[PDB]
């Protein structure tokens, strides 16, 4: 169990083991969402200044 646990620990501290890859496709969504909101803000603001 030492072999297995430290193999997973130093195979994970790079970023490849399952647990850290189940929280990374759950936070990239949050960042993508915030960025989409920023873009929509600017889109509405500029098309307001235009008119």
């Amino acid at each position: 169990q030492l072999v297995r646990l430290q193999t997973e620990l130093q195979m994970c501290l790079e970023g490849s083991h399952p647990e850290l890859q189940v929280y990374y496709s759950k936070i990239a969504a949050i960042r993508d969402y915030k960025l989409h909101r920023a873009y929509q803000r600017q889109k509405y603001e500029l098309s307001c200044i235009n008119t």
Partner: protein
């Protein structure tokens, strides 16, 4: 002489179209009474925004009118009053302690930076609207920076410092025999009524709330003195009046005035302290109920001059003014507000709506029957003699 009915969908009639001249001055929003005061000119600016972003500017003509001059102000006010207004600033008030005491200045009507300029803008817009109406250019003339109807010929009263409606009607009277003035604020339109009380050429008609209220005047038995007797109509009302009630009271009074007085230039004050949710008024009117008045006064077909007034919750005045202005152009707008620079202030669902509450209506079929019968009685001594050829008003 009053039967209560349901409130019918407001709807523009296609047989008449107008030429709206809208007056706005990008400076006006920039003045502020003080820290906590309920009067905020900024709301006029807010309404402008919606007019731009709804696409409503494309059927009317938007003008800045030149500010009114000192000697155009002294057509109604005194020289001492106007000279005080012109010389007093928030910095030298200590050297006017007599005049401030003497002209009703200091708590309900303070002095801010830009007082005289704000007054100039209001008066200018009103007089230029009247003049353009005299020259046969426009049919309706809108000026939301004017309507400060509580000001006295020698006194500041009730957030108002200059009576621009008096100047407007004076300019309208150069070419017209008979001018009607309608006042649907929640307070009594007392400056205009005190100004035109002993004449028969201006008929004032107020729909206000009489009680332990402001200003304290305008009873059912105050109907004019001298040759102006029966030429001042008051409709006192109680709390809670809503759209159906208000419409059934408002329509027949106005229609009988139009049939008897036969005026042929209407001024319309469209104050907004008579809406549900206002912070000083106490009525329970919707946006459709407050706009059906405008629609009815417009369905007659004589030169109208629409002005502003009260409204102390900015959101609701802005929305109802934009909706009314859309209605003057034969356009029923859409309920979803377009994105604009004030896409706050419109919580929680961002729509073109003013919502009523459930508070109770203290006005019942007998009080109103009595009031309207007294009025219909007072309102038959105001016709024109049989030999007097008119111009089909």
């Amino acid at each position: 002489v009053y039967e209560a009915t349901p409130f019918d969908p407001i709807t523009v009639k296609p047989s008449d179209k107008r030429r709206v001249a809208y007056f706005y001055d990008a400076d006006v929003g920039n003045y502020a009474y003080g820290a906590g005061h309920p009067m905020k000119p900024h709301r006029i600016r807010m309404a402008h925004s919606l007019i731009m972003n709804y696409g409503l500017y494309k059927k009317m003509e938007i003008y800045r009118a030149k500010p009114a001059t000192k000697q155009e102000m002294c057509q109604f006010h005194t020289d001492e009053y106007i000279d005080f207004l012109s010389r007093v600033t928030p910095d030298n008030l200590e050297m006017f302690k007599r005049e401030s005491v003497k002209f009703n200045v200091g708590d309900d009507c303070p002095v801010f930076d830009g007082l005289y300029e704000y007054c100039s803008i209001s008066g200018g817009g009103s007089m230029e609207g009247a003049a353009r109406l005299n020259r046969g250019k426009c049919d309706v003339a809108v000026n939301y920076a004017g309507g400060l109807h509580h000001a006295k010929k020698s006194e500041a009263s009730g957030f108002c410092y200059l009576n621009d409606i008096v100047l407007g009607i004076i300019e309208l009277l150069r070419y017209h025999p008979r001018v009607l003035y309608i006042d649907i604020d929640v307070h009594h339109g007392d400056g205009v009524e005190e100004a035109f009380y002993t004449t028969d050429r201006v008929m004032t008609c107020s729909f206000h709330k009489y009680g332990e209220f402001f200003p304290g005047t305008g009873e059912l038995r105050d109907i004019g003195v001298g040759a102006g007797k029966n030429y001042a109509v008051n409709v006192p009302l109680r709390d809670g009046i809503d759209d159906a009630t208000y419409r059934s009271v408002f329509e027949p009074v106005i229609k009988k005035i139009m049939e008897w007085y036969q005026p042929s230039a209407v001024v319309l004050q469209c104050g907004g302290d008579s809406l549900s949710g206002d912070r000083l008024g106490c009525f329970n009117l919707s946006m459709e109920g407050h706009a059906n008045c405008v629609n009815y006064v417009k369905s007659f077909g004589i030169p109208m001059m629409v002005v502003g007034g009260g409204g102390y919750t900015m959101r609701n005045v802005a929305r109802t003014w934009c909706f009314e202005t859309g209605l003057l152009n034969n356009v029923v707008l859409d309920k979803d507000l377009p994105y604009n620079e004030y896409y706050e202030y419109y919580g929680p669902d961002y729509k073109l709506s003013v919502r009523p509450s459930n508070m109770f209506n203290v006005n019942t079929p007998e009080y109103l029957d009595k009031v309207m019968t007294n009025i219909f009685a007072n309102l038959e001594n105001t016709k024109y003699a049989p030999s007097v050829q008119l111009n089909h008003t």
